[PDB]
Amino acid sequence: YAWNRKRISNCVADYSVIYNFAPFFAFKCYGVSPTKLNDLCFTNVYADSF
Amino acid sequence: PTYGVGHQPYRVVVLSFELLHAPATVCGPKKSTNLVKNKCVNFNFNGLTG
Amino acid sequence: VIRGNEVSQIAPGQTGNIADYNYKLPDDFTGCVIAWNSNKLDSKPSGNY
Numbered sequence A: 001y002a003w004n005r006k007r008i009s010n011c012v013a014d015y016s017v018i019y020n021f022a023p024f025f026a027f028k029c030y031g032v033s034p035t036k037l038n039d040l041c042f043t044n045v046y047a048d049s050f
Numbered sequence B: 001p002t003y004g005v006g007h008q009p010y011r012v013v014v015l016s017f018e019l020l021h022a023p024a025t026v027c028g029p030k031k032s033t034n035l036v037k038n039k040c041v042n043f044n045f046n047g048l049t050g
Numbered sequence C: 001v002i003r004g005n006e007v008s009q010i011a012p013g014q015t016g017n018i019a020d021y022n023y024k025l026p027d028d029f030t031g032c033v034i035a036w037n038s039n040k041l042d043s044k045p046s047g048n049y
Helices: none
Strands: A004-008 A047-048 B010-014 C033-037
Touching: none
Parallel strands: none
Antiparallel strands: A004 A047, B010 C033
16 A cells, blocks of 8 residues: 555666566566567666565 | 575476478377278378368 | 476577577477476485586
8 A cells, every 4th residue: 555666767777687686486577578678678667566 | 495486496307299291100099990992981090180 | 407487488489598508499399398396306405506
């Protein structure tokens, strides 16, 4: 009910180090494949944690 | 043994097959039936049904 | 043997880090992959290296 939103911008995102931080199983995504997150790039990245 | 759940040791045995027009050697367990001629009959020549 | 985050990694039409060097499946093929849990089957008291 009080989830914290952290805005991530103006940096270089390497998504290969996410697997070494949390012991999850599947990188479940809807619009972008997890193996193609590095060649192309976006405007802003937001993180919601609950 | 005290590691996280996201990188537990697993095991894989692959049983990949292939579909070729090569002379087939490995099949399933079946039975052979003698030839018939000039008759409308269903056939099972090496798995090629019709 | 494989790691935990590798059952979905080894697939036709998939990339990553394992599929580049260790084991790569062709995109169009028949047959498949059998996987399970072998955490206690690969747990020495000092670990596996």
